[PDB]
From a paper:
The crystal structure of wild-type HxlR without DNA and FA treatment (HxlR-WT) was also solved to 2.6-Å resolution. Both FA-treated and -untreated HxlR adopt an overall topology similar to the previously reported MarR/DUF24 family proteins that bind DNA in a dimeric form, with each monomer consisting of dimerization domain (helices α1 and α5) and winged helix-turn-helix (wHTH) DNA-binding domain (helices α2, α3, α4, and β-strands). Our study on the FA-sensing transcription factor HxlR revealed that FA induced a specific intrahelical crosslinking reaction between residues Cys11 and Lys13. The resulting methylene bridge (Cys-CH2-Lys) on HxlR’s helix α1 caused unwinding and rotation of its N-terminus (“N-terminal helix-flipping”) that allosterically rotated its DNA-binding domain with enhanced DNA affinity and transcriptional activation. Taken together, we confirmed that HxlR uses a gain-of-function, intrahelical crosslinking mechanism between its N-terminal residues Cys11 and Lys13 to sense FA and trigger the transcriptional responses.
After optimizing the DNA sequence, we successfully crystallized the HxlR-DNA complex after FA treatment and the resulting structure, HxlR-WT-FA-DNA, was solved to 2.9-Å resolution. The distance between the DNA-binding helices α4 and α4′ were 34.8 Å in HxlR-WT-FA-DNA and 44.0 Å in HxlR-WT, consistent with the DNA-bound and non-DNA-bound forms of MarR/DUF24 family proteins, respectively. Interestingly, a covalent bridge was clearly visible between the side-chains of Cys11 and Lys13 on the 2Fo-Fc electron density map of the HxlR-WT-FA-DNA structure, while the side-chains of Cys11 and Lys13 were located oppositely in helix α1 and their side-chains were separated 9.6 Å away from each other in the HxlR-WT structure. Further refinement of the HxlR-WT-FA-DNA structure modeled a methylene bridge connecting the thiol group on Cys11 and the amine group on Lys13 (Cys-CH2-Lys). When the dimeric form of HxlR-WT-FA-DNA and HxlR-WT were superimposed on one monomer, the non-superimposed subunits showed a large conformational change, with the wHTH domain rotated 21.9 degree and tips of the β-wings translocated 24.6 Å. Whereas the N-terminal residues formed an intact helix α1 in the HxlR-WT structure, this helix breaks at Cys11 in HxlR-WT-FA-DNA, with residues before Cys11 becoming unstructured. This helix breakage is likely due to the FA-triggered Cys11-Lys13 crosslinking reaction, which produced a covalent methylene bridge between these two residues that were originally separated by 9.6 Å and located on the opposite sides of helix α1. Consequently, FA-triggered intrahelical crosslinking and “N-terminal helix-flipping” induced a coordinated rotation and movement of helices at HxlR’s dimer interface, which allosterically rearranged its wHTH domains to adopt a more optimal conformation for DNA binding.
Numbering used by the authors:
A (entry chain A), B (entry chain B): 2 to 111
The structure:
DNA sequence: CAGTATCCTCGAGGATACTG
DNA sequence: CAGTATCCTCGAGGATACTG
């Protein structure tokens, strides 16, 4: 696994290691609330990300068994990304963080 | 605000900005589940952290309005750290990450 | 379309000595 | 006790170019 080397003082740090990476929560959000997307579709939904980084974050999310990757032997190539059942289990946490973020922004910019 | 210089694609990225720092979730966990802790008491609870990093994360959490800092004019000095109501509202997310983390920790090592 | 291949920056985090 | 003052490490993320 990715986290075989790491030493944690809490299982929460492990969750953070799965979703903490720079763009991962944005990726997981789009896949969990819009279903399956091909690579170039994710890249258009996330314009500021570079190609090497988008694939890297997707690969780490796949090694963590959070994201499923499906390659089809077609021309032009076709690769689909979607959430695994464990990825789906991460959605309640992501939603909680979305609502907490909205509530936090209210109080700091008034 | 700490976040005046930062740009986000989601409100979840804001929550992550608050709690994602290297030792922050641990510190919030101790404060929310064991109450107030003095500086050296926290340093004892987290033996690996250095004093410079501990004060840094506490200052950021304070500046994010998550942690309260109380200084007493006594000898020896006495500084108490605790959760503000916004910090306490973060605990459900931390507990949800704790439970998700232990379930993940058991599944991948199967 | 959906990837690979190289090289590099920068700032979060750290070791240690000192101190009001 | 609760921190500062110096100097330093290191790797995630990014710039930039190529491709089956
Ligand atoms: Mg006490
Ligand atoms: Mg080259």
């Amino acid at each position: 696994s990715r986290m075989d080397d790491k030493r944690f003082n809490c299982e929460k740090e492990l969750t953070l290691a799965v979703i903490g990476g720079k763009w991962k929560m944005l990726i997981l959000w789009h896949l969990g609330k819009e279903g399956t997307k091909r690579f170039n579709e994710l890249k258009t939904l996330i314009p500021d990300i570079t190609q090497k980084i988008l694939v890297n974050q997707l690969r780490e999310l796949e090694q963590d068994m959070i994201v499923h990757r499906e390659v089809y032997p077609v021309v032009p190539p076709k690769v689909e990304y979607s959430l695994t059942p464990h990825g789906e289990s991460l959605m309640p946490i992501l939603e909680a963080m979305y609502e907490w973020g909205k509530g936090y922004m209210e109080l700091i910019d008034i």
